[PDB]
Amino acid sequence: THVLRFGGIFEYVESGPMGAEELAFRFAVNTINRNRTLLPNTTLTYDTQKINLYDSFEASKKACDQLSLGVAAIFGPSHSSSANAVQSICNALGVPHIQTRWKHQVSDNKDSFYVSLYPDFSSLSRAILDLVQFFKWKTVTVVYDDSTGLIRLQELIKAPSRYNLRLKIRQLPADTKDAKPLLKEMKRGKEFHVIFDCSHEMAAGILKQALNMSMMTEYYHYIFTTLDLFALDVEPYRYSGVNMTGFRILNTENTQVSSIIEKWSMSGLLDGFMTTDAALMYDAVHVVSVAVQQFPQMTVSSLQCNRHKPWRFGTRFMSLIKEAHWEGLTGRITFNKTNGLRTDFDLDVISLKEEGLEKIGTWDPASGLNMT
Amino acid sequence: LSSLRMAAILDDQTVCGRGERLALALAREQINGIIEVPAKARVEVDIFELQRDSQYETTDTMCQILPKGVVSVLGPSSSPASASTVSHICGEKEIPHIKVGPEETPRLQYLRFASVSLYPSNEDVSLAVSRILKSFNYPSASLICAKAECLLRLEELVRGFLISKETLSVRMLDRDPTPLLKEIRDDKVSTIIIDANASISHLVLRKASELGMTSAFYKYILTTMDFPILHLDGIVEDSSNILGFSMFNTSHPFYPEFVRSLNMSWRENCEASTYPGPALSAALMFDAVHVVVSAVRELNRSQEIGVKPLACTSANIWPHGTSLMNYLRMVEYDGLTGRVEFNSKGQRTNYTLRILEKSRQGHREIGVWYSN
Numbered sequence: 001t002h003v004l005r006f007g008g009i010f011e012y013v014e015s016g017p018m019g020a021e022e023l024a025f026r027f028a029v030n031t032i033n034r035n036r037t038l039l040p041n042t043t044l045t046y047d048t049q050k051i052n053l054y055d056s057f058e059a060s061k062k063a064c065d066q067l068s069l070g071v072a073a074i075f076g077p078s079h080s081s082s083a084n085a086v087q088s089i090c091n092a093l094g095v096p097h098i099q100t101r102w103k104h105q106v107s108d109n110k111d112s113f114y115v116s117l118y119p120d121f122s123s124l125s126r127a128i129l130d131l132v133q134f135f136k137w138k139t140v141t142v143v144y145d146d147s148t149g150l151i152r153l154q155e156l157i158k159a160p161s162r163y164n165l166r167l168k169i170r171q172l173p174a175d176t177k178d179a180k181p182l183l184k185e186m187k188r189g190k191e192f193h194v195i196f197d198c199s200h201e202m203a204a205g206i207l208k209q210a211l212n213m214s215m216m217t218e219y220y221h222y223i224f225t226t227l228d229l230f231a232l233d234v235e236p237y238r239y240s241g242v243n244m245t246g247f248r249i250l251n252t253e254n255t256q257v258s259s260i261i262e263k264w265s266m267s268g269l270l271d272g273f274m275t276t277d278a279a280l281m282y283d284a285v286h287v288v289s290v291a292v293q294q295f296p297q298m299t300v301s302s303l304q305c306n307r308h309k310p311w312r313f314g315t316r317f318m319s320l321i322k323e324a325h326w327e328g329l330t331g332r333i334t335f336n337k338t339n340g341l342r343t344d345f346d347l348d349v350i351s352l353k354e355e356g357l358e359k360i361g362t363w364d365p366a367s368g369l370n371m372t
Numbered sequence: 373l374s375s376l377r378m379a380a381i382l383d384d385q386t387v388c389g390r391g392e393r394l395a396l397a398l399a400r401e402q403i404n405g406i407i408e409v410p411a412k413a414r415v416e417v418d419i420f421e422l423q424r425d426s427q428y429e430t431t432d433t434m435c436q437i438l439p440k441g442v443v444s445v446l447g448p449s450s451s452p453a454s455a456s457t458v459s460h461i462c463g464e465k466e467i468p469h470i471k472v473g474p475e476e477t478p479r480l481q482y483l484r485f486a487s488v489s490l491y492p493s494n495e496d497v498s499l500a501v502s503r504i505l506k507s508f509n510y511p512s513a514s515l516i517c518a519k520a521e522c523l524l525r526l527e528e529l530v531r532g533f534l535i536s537k538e539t540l541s542v543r544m545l546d547r548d549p550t551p552l553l554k555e556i557r558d559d560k561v562s563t564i565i566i567d568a569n570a571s572i573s574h575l576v577l578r579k580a581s582e583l584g585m586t587s588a589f590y591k592y593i594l595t596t597m598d599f600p601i602l603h604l605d606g607i608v609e610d611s612s613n614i615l616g617f618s619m620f621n622t623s624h625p626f627y628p629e630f631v632r633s634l635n636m637s638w639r640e641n642c643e644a645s646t647y648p649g650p651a652l653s654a655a656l657m658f659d660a661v662h663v664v665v666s667a668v669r670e671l672n673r674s675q676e677i678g679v680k681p682l683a684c685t686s687a688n689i690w691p692h693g694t695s696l697m698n699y700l701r702m703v704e705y706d707g708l709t710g711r712v713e714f715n716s717k718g719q720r721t722n723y724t725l726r727i728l729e730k731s732r733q734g735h736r737e738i739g740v741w742y743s744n
């Protein structure tokens with residue numbers, strides 16, 4: 001019967017022929033076609049293009065190949081420079097661009113044909129302030145990776161203007177993974193309260209060296225921006241008396257979700273976990289499908305870059321996506337109509353107890369922090 | 373061989389513009405007007421216009437440029453997103469990119485390097501502003517930013533200071549600065565740093581003037597580079613301390629003529645509004661033409677240089693681009709914007725920023741900032 005084609009663009013990966021995003025994308029499409037309640041009369045297909053990491057110019061060409069081929073939406077790529085290149089094209093030809101990773105969304109930008117499933121970093125930052133105020137911290141030190149800007153932490157940087165807070169900003173070496181020089185500076189200055197803005201991979205390695213420097217003790221309290229905090233191995237640390245706190249957006253307490261995480265299972269990091277980066281791609285294919293069910297008449301057109309005019313179904317389809325609602329792996333999903341960003345969402349608060357990383361509360365933008 | 377052709381991308385408007393198109397013409401005629409024995413190929417500047425700061429439009433523009441056989445690509449001066457696209461494609465084809473405007477992508481150090489930049493680096497501006505603050509004995513200061521990107525431009529400054537009401541606060545515009553300025557006054561902070569475009573800076577200063585915060589107790593530092601063409605009528609006083617920067621060497625032999633020309637161009641389009649003075653970007657465009665011609669001729673003295681058509685669809689490069697990059701970094705030129713030299717990374721060095729101070733009628737130079 002009927003067929004609707006998505007296109008996905010994925011970076012090449014050292015790991016193997018297929019990265020986490022691409023595997024989750026396919027995993028999601030298969031599940032939805034096997035499902036009868038969701039898209040009963042539609043069968044999802046797709047075209048995949050791959051590009052080298054950091055190759056924004058190749059991302060343009062591949063995006064244009066897909067639009068020329070005919071697609072209803074484009075998922076990926078992950079790296080910001082390429083994501084921006086594709087976003088620009090998708091806006092020009094009026095085909096929806098579905099993003100799953102965070103990227104710096106420039107201010108003066110006026111692209112409107114895209115949506116992002118990553119939790120807005122300003123909301124995440126407000127949740128981190130709420131932790132800071134709750135713990136009654138007067139002084140804190142923010143450590144960020146050169147890779148990501150200061151920009152996404154802007155809510156944190158503005159805080160000392162409104163609250164009695166003293167904030168010291170420290171940057172992680174860009175040339176290396178070793179951070180002992182930085183840890184030494186902090187230890188020296190009695191910087192016991194710390195916020196780490198970095199991936200969970202980099203966090204695992206940073207706690208390792210922090211342990212080799214007697215900084216994993218009852219004196220130090222660490223807050224992490226990574227949502228994949230739970231997927232860390234905290235065996236070495238769970239008796240040192242150190243406090244660790246962070247957030248989780250994977251709704252793992254929900255049994256329907258846990259079973260899917262299980263199928264998916266078939267350095268410092270554990271195994272048998274679905275990363276948030278992969279869960280978000282899986283939820284993107286679903287939330288877009290909810291929009292396709294409310295628009296059964298659309299048909300992809302072969303659009304050519306710098307020649308044709310916007311897809312005649314684009315504007316409608318993009319509206320429906322921004323209005324879509326879906327209960328997914330990462331809890332309830334809803335976009336902000338004003339900017340296509342995911343500024344409203346639910347978090348669980350996780351913290352290091354003697355038994356391991358456990359839940360100790362929740363958070364959402366409307367009612368603030370809710371420790372239990 | 374046949375001629376030094378270079379392309380320039382202009383995001384400048386034709387009516388009441390910054391004079392970029394005319395500045396390019398002036399340099400081209402000045403250089404071609406000098407006859408030499410032996411004679412040398414004529415200089416040509418092919419001009420391409422950019423309607424919007426679009427990566428999508430810019431990629432198309434680069435694709436029209438590559439077949440023309442050019443030696444460099446200049447600009448754009450005020451489209452950060454487009455400028456990084458030009459840098460990337462230039463890197464791929466190994467045609468030098470002469471930067472004359474803000475670019476606020478990293479870019480990653482380990483990508484292809486095909487650039488020099490006549491525009492001050494973010495670090496340079498942050499250092500200059502720090503040095504002025506040091507001159508005041510590091511007062512309590514508040515930063516007022518138009519958009520969040522100021523944490524990127526002034527990254528070096530912000531992370532050097534402790535962030536708090538007593539040291540350095542950060543505030544951003546939503547768009548009425550009166551709320552911010554009152555919060556700053558309630559903190560009893562005397563020194564304010566304004567990072568915005570000329571018109572927004574003018575707006576912050578006008579609202580401060582209304583609140584009486586424009587007396588001699590306050591010191592403002594504007595990071596805008598069009599500080600000399602920013603005219604504060606009925607805002608500045610005898611008491612006022614409003615500091616800013618300028619790159620112009622008014623003792624340059626061609627400066628007076630350069631201003632007369634841009635003055636008349638401005639009248640024959642905008643008889644309604646009065647001429648503000650030369651925009652920094654026009655001057656940089658002029659200097660850029662001299663820098664490129666200088667490097668190419670030095671290269672042609674020890675190699676035979678040839679250019680051929682390139683294409684976006686071809687893996688071909690310009691074989692001589694890599695040598696021209698060496699000769700571009702070795703350039704030592706005396707232009708409208710001061711001394712132009714470059715370091716191993718393509719950043720401008722051994723130059724100065726004149727530190728000006730507004731007065732009721734004109735400016736006063738109260739010192740300079742160096743790099744060496």
Ligand SMILES: *[C@@H]1O[C@H](CO)[C@@H](O)[C@H](O)[C@H]1NC(C)=O
Nearest residue numbers: 031034035036037038039256
């Ligand atoms: C099928 O789709 C429905 C409706 O979207 C969804 O709620 C449900 O989880 C899916 N059922 C299964 C078992 O695939």
Ligand SMILES: *[C@@H]1O[C@H](CO)[C@@H](O)[C@H](O)[C@H]1NC(C)=O
Nearest residue numbers: 122335336337338339343344
């Ligand atoms: C949309 O985002 C803006 C700020 O990014 C926020 O003020 C507004 O409340 C958001 N709307 C929704 C529906 O969350």
Ligand SMILES: *[C@@H]1O[C@H](CO)[C@@H](O)[C@H](O)[C@H]1NC(C)=O
Nearest residue numbers: 375376411412413669672673
């Ligand atoms: C360089 O090569 C010769 C002189 O060396 C001359 O014919 C040619 O015009 C020169 N090209 C340029 C652009 O200087």
Ligand SMILES: *[C@@H]1O[C@H](CO)[C@@H](O)[C@H](O)[C@H]1NC(C)=O
Nearest residue numbers: 518519545568569570571572
């Ligand atoms: C300055 O920036 C503001 C946004 O903060 C924008 O609205 C305004 O148009 C800009 N001014 C000019 C003339 O570029």
Ligand SMILES: *[C@@H]1O[C@H](CO)[C@@H](O)[C@H](O)[C@H]1NC(C)=O
Nearest residue numbers: 631632635636647648649650
């Ligand atoms: C522009 O030219 C006229 C010529 O007399 C002069 O009065 C005016 O001062 C000039 N503007 C500037 C800023 O130099």
Ligand SMILES: *[C@@H]1O[C@H](CO)[C@@H](O)[C@H](O)[C@H]1NC(C)=O
Nearest residue numbers: 621622623624625710711724
């Ligand atoms: C300005 O021009 C004069 C004359 O050309 C020159 O002597 C001086 O070095 C220039 N100023 C700077 C700082 O480059």
Ligand SMILES: *[C@@H]1O[C@H](CO)[C@@H](O)[C@H](O)[C@H]1NC(C)=O
Nearest residue numbers: 704710711713721722723744
């Ligand atoms: C820097 O520029 C000045 C001219 O303004 C020049 O005299 C001086 O030698 C330069 N320094 C170096 C080491 O290049």
Ligand SMILES: *[C@H]1O[C@H](CO)[C@@H](O)[C@H](O)[C@H]1NC(C)=O
Nearest residue numbers: 361362364367368369370371
């Ligand atoms: C606070 O926490 C509980 C447990 O997560 C949650 O059920 C409740 O809705 C939260 N309060 C509100 C109104 O958000």
Ligand SMILES: [Cl-]
Nearest residue numbers: 136137138139
């Ligand atoms: Cl404290």
